[PDB]
Ligand binder design. Structure first.
Ligand code: CLA
Ligand code: CLA
Ligand code: CLA
Ligand code: CLA
Ligand code: CLA
Ligand code: CLA
Ligand SMILES: CCCCCCCCCCCCCCCC(=O)OC[C@H](COP(=O)(O)OC[C@@H](O)CO)OC(=O)CCCCCCCCCCCCCCC
Ligand SMILES: CCCCCCCCCCCCCCCC(=O)OC[C@H](COP(=O)(O)OC[C@@H](O)CO)OC(=O)CCCCCCCCCCCCCCC
Ligand SMILES: CC(/C=C/C=C(C)/C=C/[C@@]12O[C@]1(C)C[C@@H](O)CC2(C)C)=C\C=C\C=C(C)\C=C\C=C(C)\C=C\[C@@]12O[C@]1(C)C[C@@H](O)CC2(C)C
Ligand SMILES: CC(/C=C/C=C(C)/C=C/[C@@]12O[C@]1(C)C[C@@H](O)CC2(C)C)=C\C=C\C=C(C)\C=C\C=C(C)\C=C\[C@@]12O[C@]1(C)C[C@@H](O)CC2(C)C
Ligand SMILES: CCCCCCCCCCCCO[C@H]1O[C@H](CO)[C@@H](O[C@H]2O[C@H](CO)[C@@H](O)[C@H](O)[C@H]2O)[C@H](O)[C@H]1O
Ligand code: SF4
Lengths: 211, 79, 73, 41, 742, 216
């Protein structure tokens, strides 16, 4: 199977045969050698990707709107220390209680596929997803996309999500590191790079012999 | 609080560790090669046994009364 | 005084352990089931079966004398 | 990866991990609850 | 003949064998049945020649393991440099070397550990260190934490490089056996490159960096105001301001006008009056001369280019009428067995380390090191212990070679065979020497004790009573003190201040060095040293010579190198193996080194170290009581152990409490070793039988059958815990005392 | 045909082969690692081509400044352009470390591709590059890729002219390697540009040689 690789001319590892979406044969350390760990890691990557997409949107779009003056949200770094309707610990406990149920259903489906597909209260709901990680149904798929029957058209959309989500993870890590290293918002960092690309960079802050 | 309460807490913890160790040994004893599991620990089975140790006093009294705690035919030397 | 009487109890029970182990296992053990044929005092039973240094009951006496001296000290 | 998991289950490695976790837990407890001589409860 | 020979991809890189604990051994690979398997696994791990029979695999494993040890050493050096860059008061110490105590370790506040963070000075709290890294860094010219951090990063990079090199040369490109046997090429490359080029590079660093920076520091310039090292290279005007001969460039070097460089390449003895250390210009001329000598020496042995000496012919040529075939057959032994090379190298390295200790206290090479008494004592004791351990290991691995790799076919009438044929005479004469030395020295001590107890001090072997002067040592001292006038006229002062002639060097109100008088007590103590050393040599040499056979056991070489006994027959044959001879030599080496370090500590505290005040009056730490109180065993017991242990036993509640804690713990561990040393295996096996019955009664017996430790393992555990306890006791005692009074 | 012994493995098929190998580095008996006989000629050619570029580019700006083509603000010696800031520095549109990062990115693409073609000869012309993978399939010898880009004029159409061109390339490359070493050493000893050194040796040949410059 000749598909594009992360490293042209190299050989795809045996455990990566190109079935999974976003499979460019990237596994230098061989962490996906064990098939069961491979399935666990597929699920972990999907979850980290979706969480990172949500986080990247919620980090970058509010800052852009604040910079444009449309909104007045604080910086994402300081939003933890703001005055909300309740003490955070209470909000954290509520969060833990709700994700207990959600994560428990997801965990039960990962461990034993096809075992939590029916609504426990009204038994006539019945999520209509057939793959682990893609619940389908009405709650998680109202518009019917992703339930199509076309071959390699599902792989296309799944690769789309996989790639926008990997980019989101890299972007979120970048936002965190940039906030820690240069004490300013990400949009100011972008405008600094755009103002003077040659000199406004990571080397601008440090003091080096050459410059 | 000087002696009795910490003593009870220690007795609970030590009984927990001893009971789960004994349970793991008993479960490993019937295996293809018990010594291999004796040096290389079966982590999932060990975790299951370790988690089941919360109610160790009840299980201990249960096996004491059920007659499955002690042995009667053991190796001895020339008396 | 509490701590010292407890150390003394340790010494007494340990010396008793050594001496009683020597007396009861004098006629034989798993490592050498026919010790009674070799008398009270003999050096060893050779390096076979893993090594049998200090195997007789005389050697238990020998070991317990050190613990007696330590306890009385 | 199966061989790595088997190696990580050996007695010295598991003992190191377990005792490191236990020592960390005790150290943190003594950091937040220091100088504890008698049990208040 | 000499060429690069390697094999491509010999061993595949995988984690499969990491899950097979005993893969390297054909008997251990089957798994454990008793608890003896674990000890056998951890005991046979790095004994490569017992696994396979071909020299190629052994050589490759040795090469890769040496790469690994190099990587570990690089990690250690990087750690020292980083911990000095971030957790030290090195800059404050640089400002005031004579009042700030060096410190590079800081403890966390958890369980009362706060008390260990002492007030070392410079607005800093931490553990005072005695490794002497501050003095070495100052001599190197380091004046900031940035340089130390850069060195730490470089050390980490080098550790990674060594790890990669080890992996490469084992798992990817392994050299062949013919590559390792190029001893002529190995000696040429190592002796020329590693030694001469390294010494030349260090001489270059000294001349171009260390001389100006230390010159400015000694003048009195504040460390923050001194220009950086590259400013003396980019701007030679500054270096010519300090040493004017740099203004001539390299023209005097190539025109052979070497006398022009006499202002920074000097030959002067003694110490710098400001810092109490050796002049760095002498260190420059001497690392340069060493570089030249080693570079000349490294072009001696024959290689692909015809010229040179051949070691085999040289060895086969030197033989005479007393020794039969002479040195014939040694080349094959030394190019065939790793153990013979290990024995020779261990012996030489241990002797060299002892020489390092002596020369380093006598001629302190670093600034402000002589007046830091704790550092001097620590360095001397440490490298002396290291040398003792290495010289014992030499005998151990020589006996291993004799048991395993010896071949009587190759050795017919050479030196080895003729040594093995007159061994009874050697051992007998050496036994007589040991007895004679022991009597006529320790009996002198006991005679002194008895005379002192009887109230007859006029019958003692003391300076005031019957005298025993060391006339030979006194003559050597006087001769070496008068060298700068007759036999080494170009020297300014003598090699060291310890010789009889000379004066006093004082730095910050403390004596750096001073002439060391030798009297009756010194005579007694060196002859004690001779006794202990000849006895240790007797034990180890008897072990090596009788390793293959004797009259008692004609076939000892069949039983192996490390076996417990050969049964209770023939009266009893316990400890007839060379391993047990090493086991006893370890105890006697401990005895010898302990006496040596006690002699050094007492003599220095009593006659050299001290405080000097106005008008040049010297007060010593113990007030010169070594000459009178060291001639008796009671004198030692009272005036050294009882008097000088007051600091370690009173250190509770201060920053020195850890030393008292470890003092007690070391006495404890030393006592604990006696239960392994004095007992036997059968008792513990029977006790374990009873305990196993107890565990069986509750269905909780282990699958791996518990077993008592083997006889050899019992001996090894006993000796290891014994040595650890004794050495740690001495460590805590010395450090507490010298940190308190130094 | 020159220099030292005919080592019995340097038969003469290689361009520039004269049997010069005193240390026997290219003996194929034990030939693992980077001392493989198939790697050393390629490495010689690569440091040689880079040395040709380096020598030409380190001597060009000073000569152009002396003639007058380029502004005298850019006629600085090679070591006063930014390689060694302690010696001399020039201000470009970016600081030298951003320039280094960009250079490492571009050279990383080029060099990792060239390496993959060396190790996997047929590759780099199979996967989809941005349309240029068609011209990037090196034909045969890794050191001589050719094609519509690397040889876009069509030299060496016949075998013999190609042999002459290969020999010429090897000699100019070795000469430039020695020239670059000379640039380094003369910069250390004299502190001026190589062209100034040439003019100094030409003006007073007897008093302006290495023996005079022993004092710096
Ligand atoms: C993958 C998404 C992504 C994107 C689009 C950017 C984009 C940018 N980063 Mg960034 N970064 C990323 C990931 C990303 N980064 C990650 C994963 C890390 C962690 C290693 C960083 C760490 C980082 C630092 C430390 C700095 C930047 C800076 C910058 C800006 C100038 C480029 C530069 O100097 O580098 C630019 C807007 C620099 C900047 O904004 O300074 C003006 C800067 O100082 N980034
Ligand atoms: C028989 C031996 C023995 C015993 C009974 C104790 C008992 C104690 N030590 Mg001690 N100690 C010992 C040996 C012993 N030690 C030795 C050998 C050393 C030297 C290494 C020390 C060094 C030492 C230090 C340095 C400290 C103690 C402390 C303590 C106290 C425990 C603090 C606490 O409650 O933690 C709370 C932890 C728990 C309740 C564990 C909970 C576990 C689970 C989560 C519960 C369910 C307690 C009085 C600490 C103290 O406060 O002393 C007054 C303290 O700072 N000890
Ligand atoms: C032989 C090597 C060696 C040794 C014995 C130590 C020992 C120590 N280091 Mg250290 N360290 C080393 C190498 C070493 N380091 C290297 C190579 C680095 C650079 C990566 C560091 C970087 C480092 C940091 C950054 C810190 C320590 C700290 C510590 C202390 C506590 C560590 C702990 O319990 O966790 C301890 C004294 C900690 C410390 O001293 O806290 C006060 C601490 O914060 N180390
Ligand atoms: C660079 C020096 C050096 C090197 C490379 C070796 C190498 C070796 N030694 Mg040796 N040794 C040395 C110095 C050295 N030794 C010194 C200075 C001493 C004096 C104490 C000894 C005393 C010694 C003894 C008594 C024995 C060895 C043994 C061995 C072999 C296996 C060691 C082992 O299994 O580790 C296992 C490591 C441990 C168990 C850790 C304990 C701490 C191996 C060839 C053994 C041997 O040769 O068996 C045939 C053996 O019995 N060595
Ligand atoms: C004790 C130090 C030491 C020694 C004796 C050798 C010896 C050798 N190395 Mg080597 N190497 C070392 C350290 C050492 N290496 C380190 C620290 C690294 C990491 C940078 C390497 C990385 C390395 C590579 C990458 C290669 C060698 C190669 C070689 C061989 C020929 C090298 C030559 O001609 O020069 C030779 C067996 C070459 C080889 O195996 O070819 C036969 C080769 O390709 N070495
Ligand atoms: C290979 C190589 C490398 C690494 C460089 C690198 C450089 N050249 Mg250059 N050069 C080269 C070959 C090379 N050259 C060749 C083969 C010629 C002919 C030149 C002719 C040349 C000129 C005429 C100038 C440079 C300049 C420069 C510098 C700035 C380049 C720039 O702005 O874009 C930079 C150090 C400029 C400079 O130093 O300023 C400049 O004026 N180069
Ligand atoms: C960073 C410095 C370097 C670190 C280690 C790098 C190791 C790289 C791979 C080494 C083996 C090379 C040969 C592969 C081949 C090999 O080893 O044996 C081959 C074997 C093949 O197993 P399969 O079941 O795939 O195939 C069996 C066949 O019979 C049929 O296909 O196993 C593998 O392929 C696993 C490879 C990775 C094994 C290690 C995985 C984990 C490594 C990292 C552990 C730490 C992770 C930390 C994460 C934070
Ligand atoms: C003094 C003895 C002396 O002159 O030794 C030197 C003497 C030298 O003998 P040769 O001249 O025969 O030695 C020739 C070569 O073997 C020298 O490498 O050797 C012996 O006598 C053997 C060792 C005796 C050791 C006695 C103690
Ligand atoms: C980078 C990352 C992981 C990177 C992993 C890599 C590269 C692994 C590489 C390899 O393993 C492979 C593939 C194969 C192996 O053989 C080799 C290696 C090389 C080992 C995860 C990021 C993961 C990033 C995640 C999950 C981000 C989540 C963000 C959230 C939830 C944000 C929430 C908020 O920002 C809002 C929205 C606004 C405010 O409320 C504030 C908060 C609360 C902060
Ligand atoms: C690559 C190279 C030079 C590259 C230079 C570059 C890119 C320069 C770039 C720049 O300058 C510019 C343009 C402009 C500046 O502003 C900036 C920089 C960036 C500075 C030189 C290689 C130089 C390589 C050299 C000199 C190699 C010498 C090898 C010898 C002599 C070998 C001899 C033998 O190996 C044989 C043949 C056979 C064996 O058996 C025996 C022995 C004797 C071992
Ligand atoms: C193995 C080599 C490792 C180190 C590599 C880098 C070496 C750098 C040092 C070599 C330069 C020697 O420097 C020495 O001569 C220089 C001239 O040549 C002098 O430089 C002086 O004259 C130069 C012109 O020639 C001027 O541009 C300088 O401003 C002036 O300071 C230095 O004042 C002197 O210190
Ligand atoms: S070593 Fe032990 S078993 Fe061997 S003879 Fe001596 S006492 Fe007996």
């Amino acid at each position: 199977n000749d598909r594009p690789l992360w490293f042209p001319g190299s050989k795809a590892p045996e455990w990566l045969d190109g079935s999974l979406p976003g499979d460019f044969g990237f596994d230098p350390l061989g962490l996906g050698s064990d098939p069961e760990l491979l399935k666990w890691f597929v699920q972990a990557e999907l979850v980290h990707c979706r969480w990172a997409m949500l986080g990247a949107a919620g980090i970058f779009i509010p800052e852009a709107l604040t910079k444009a003056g449309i909104l007045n949200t604080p910086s994402w770094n300081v939003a933890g220390d703001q005055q909300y309707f309740a003490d955070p610990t209470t909000l954290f406990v509520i969060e833990l209680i709700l994700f207990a149920w959600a994560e428990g259903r997801r965990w039960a489906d990962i461990v034993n596929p096809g075992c939590v597909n029916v609504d426990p209260v009204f038994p006539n709901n019945k999520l209509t997803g057939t793959d682990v990680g893609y619940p389908g149904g009405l709650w998680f798929d109202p518009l019917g996309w992703g339930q199509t029957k076309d071959a390699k058209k599902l792989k296309e959309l799944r690769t789309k999500e996989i790639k926008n989500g990997r980019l989101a993870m890299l972007a979120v890590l970048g936002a965190v590191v940039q906030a820690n290293y240069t004490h300013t918002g990400p949009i100011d960092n972008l405008l600094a790079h755009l103002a003077d690309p040659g000199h406004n960079t990571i080397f601008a802050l440090s003091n080096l012999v050459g410059k | 609080g000087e002696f009795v309460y910490p003593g009870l807490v220690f007795l609970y913890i030590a009984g927990w560790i001893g009971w789960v160790g004994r349970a793991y040994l008993i479960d490993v004893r019937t295996s293809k090669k018990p010594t291999e599991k004796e040096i290389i620990i079966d982590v999932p089975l060990a975790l299951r046994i370790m988690s089941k140790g919360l109610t160790w006093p009840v299980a201990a009294i249960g096996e004491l009364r059920s007659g499955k705690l002690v042995e009667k035919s053991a190796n001895i030397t020339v008396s | 005084d509490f701590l010292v009487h407890h150390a003394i109890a340790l010494g007494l029970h340990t010396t008793t352990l050594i001496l009683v182990k020597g007396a009861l296992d004098a006629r034989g053990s798993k490592l050498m089931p026919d010790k009674k044929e070799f008398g009270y005092s003999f050096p060893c039973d050779g390096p076979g079966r893993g090594g049998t240094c200090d195997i007789s009951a005389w050697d238990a006496f020998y070991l317990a004398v050190f613990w007696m001296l330590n306890t009385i000290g | 990866m199966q061989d790595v998991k088997t190696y990580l289950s050996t007695a010295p490695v598991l003992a190191t991990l377990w005792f490191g976790f236990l020592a960390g837990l005790l150290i943190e407890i003594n950091r937040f609850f220091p100088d504890a001589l008698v049990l208040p409860l | 003949e000499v060429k690069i020979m390697v094999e491509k991809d010999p061993v595949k890189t995988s984690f499969e064998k990491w899950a097979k604990p005993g893969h390297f051994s054909r008997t251990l690979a089957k798994g454990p049945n008793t608890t003896t398997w674990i000890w056998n696994l951890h005991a046979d791990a790095h004994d490569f020649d017992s696994h396979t029979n071909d020299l190629e695999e052994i050589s490759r494993k040795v090469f890769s393991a040496h790469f690994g040890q190099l990587a570990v050493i690089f990690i250690w050096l990087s750690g020292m440099y980083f911990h000095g860059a971030r957790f030290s008061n090195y800059e404050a110490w640089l400002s005031d070397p004579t009042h700030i105590k060096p410190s590079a370790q800081v403890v966390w506040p958890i369980v009362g550990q706060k008390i260990l963070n002492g007030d070392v000075g410079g607005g800093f709290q931490g553990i005072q260190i005695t490794s002497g890294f501050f003095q070495l860094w100052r001599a190197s010219g380091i004046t900031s934490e940035l340089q130390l951090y850069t060195t730490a990063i470089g050390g980490l990079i080098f550790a990674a490089l060594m790890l990669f090199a080890g992996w490469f040369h084992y798992h990817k490109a392994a050299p062949k056996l013919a590559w390792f046997q190029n001893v002529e090429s190995m000696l040429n490359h190592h002796l020329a490159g590693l030694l001469g080029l390294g010494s030349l590079a260090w001489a270059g660093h000294q001349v171009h960096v260390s001389l100006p920076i230390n010159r400015l520091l000694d003048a009195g310039v504040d460390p923050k105001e001194i220009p950086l090292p590259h400013e003396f290279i980019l701007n030679r005007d500054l270096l010519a301001q300090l040493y004017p001969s740099f203004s001539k460039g390299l023209t005097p070097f190539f025109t052979l006008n070497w006398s022009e460089y006499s202002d920074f390449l000097t030959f002067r003895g003694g110490l710098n009056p400001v810092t109490g250390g050796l002049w760095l210009t002498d260190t420059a001329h001497h690392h340069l001369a060493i570089a030249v000598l080693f570079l000349v020496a490294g072009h001696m042995y024959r290689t692909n280019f015809g010229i040179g000496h051949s070691m085999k012919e040289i060895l086969e040529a030197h033989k005479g009428p007393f020794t039969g075939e002479g040195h014939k057959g040694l080349y094959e032994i030394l190019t065939t067995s790793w153990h013979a090379q290990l024995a020779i190298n261990l012996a030489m390295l241990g002797s060299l380390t002892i020489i390092v200790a002596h020369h380093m206290y006598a001629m302190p090479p670093y600034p402000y090191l002589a007046t830091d008494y704790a550092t001097q004592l620590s360095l001397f004791t440490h490298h002396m212990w290291i040398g003792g351990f290495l010289v014992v290991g030499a005998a151990a691995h020589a006996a291993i070679f004799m048991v395993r790799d010896y071949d009587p076919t190759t050795q017919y009438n050479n030196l080895l065979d003729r040594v093995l044929r007159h061994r009874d005479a050697i051992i007998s004469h050496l036994n007589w020497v040991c007895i004679f030395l022991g009597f006529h020295s320790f009996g002198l001590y006991i005679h002194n004790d008895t005379m002192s107890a009887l109230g007859r001090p006029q019958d003692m072997f003391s300076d005031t009573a019957i005298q025993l002067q060391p006339v030979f040592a006194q003559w050597i001292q006087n001769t070496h003190a008068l060298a700068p006038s007759l036999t080494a006229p170009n020297a300014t002062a003598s090699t060291s201040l310890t010789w009889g002639g000379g004066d006093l060097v004082a730095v910050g109100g403390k004596v750096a060095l001073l002439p060391i008088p030798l009297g009756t007590a010194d005579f007694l103590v060196h002859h004690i040293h001779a006794f202990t050393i000849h006895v240790t040599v007797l034990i180890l040499l008897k072990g090596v010579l009788f390793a293959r056979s004797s009259r008692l056991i004609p076939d000892k070489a069949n039983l192996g190198f490390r076996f417990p006994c050969d049964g209770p027959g023939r009266g009893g044959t316990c400890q007839v193996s060379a391993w047990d001879h090493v086991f006893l030599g370890l105890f006697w080496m401990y005895n010898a080194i302990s006496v040596v370090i006690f002699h050094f500590s007492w003599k220095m505290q009593s006659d050299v170290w001290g405080s000097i005040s106005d008008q040049g009056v010297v007060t010593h730490i113990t007030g010169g009581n070594f000459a009178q109180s060291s001639i008796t065993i009671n004198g030692w017991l009272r005036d050294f152990l009882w008097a000088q242990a007051s600091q370690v036993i009173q250190s509770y509640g201060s920053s020195l409490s850890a030393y008292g804690l470890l003092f007690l713990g070391a006495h404890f561990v030393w006592a604990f070793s006696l239960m392994f040393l004095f007992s036997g295996r059968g008792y513990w096996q029977e006790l374990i039988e009873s305990i196993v019955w107890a565990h069986n009664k509750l269905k909780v017996a282990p699958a791996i059958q518990p077993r008592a430790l083997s006889i050899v393992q019992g001996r090894a555990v006993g000796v290891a815990h014994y040595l650890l306890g004794g050495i740690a006791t001495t460590w805590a005692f010395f450090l507490a005392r010298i940190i308190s009074v130094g | 045909f020159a220099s030292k012994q005919s080592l019995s493995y340097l038969d003469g098929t290689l361009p520039g082969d004269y049997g010069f190998d005193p240390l026997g580095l290219m003996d194929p008996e034990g030939a693992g690692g980077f001392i493989d006989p198939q790697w050393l000629p390629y490495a010689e050619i690569i440091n040689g081509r880079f040395a040709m570029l380096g020598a030409a580019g380190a001597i060009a700006p000073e000569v152009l400044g002396r003639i007058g083509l380029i502004p005298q603000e850019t006629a600085i010696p090679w070591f006063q352009s930014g390689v060694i800031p302690p010696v001399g520095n020039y201000s470009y549109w970016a600081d030298p470390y951003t320039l280094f990062v960009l250079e490492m990115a571009l050279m990383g693409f080029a060099e990792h591709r060239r390496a993959q073609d060396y190790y996997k000869p047929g590759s780099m012309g199979k996967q989809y590059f941005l349309g240029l993978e068609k011209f990037l399939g090196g034909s045969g010898n890794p050191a001589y890729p050719g094609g519509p880009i690397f040889n876009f004029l069509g030299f060496g159409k016949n075998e013999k002219e190609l042999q002459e061109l290969k020999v010429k390339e090897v000699k100019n490359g070795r000469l430039a390697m020695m020239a670059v070493l000379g640039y380094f050493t003369q910069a250390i000893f004299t502190g001026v540009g190589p062209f100034q050194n040439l003019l100094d040796h030409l003006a007073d040949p007897v008093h302006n040689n290495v023996l005079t410059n022993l004092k710096i």
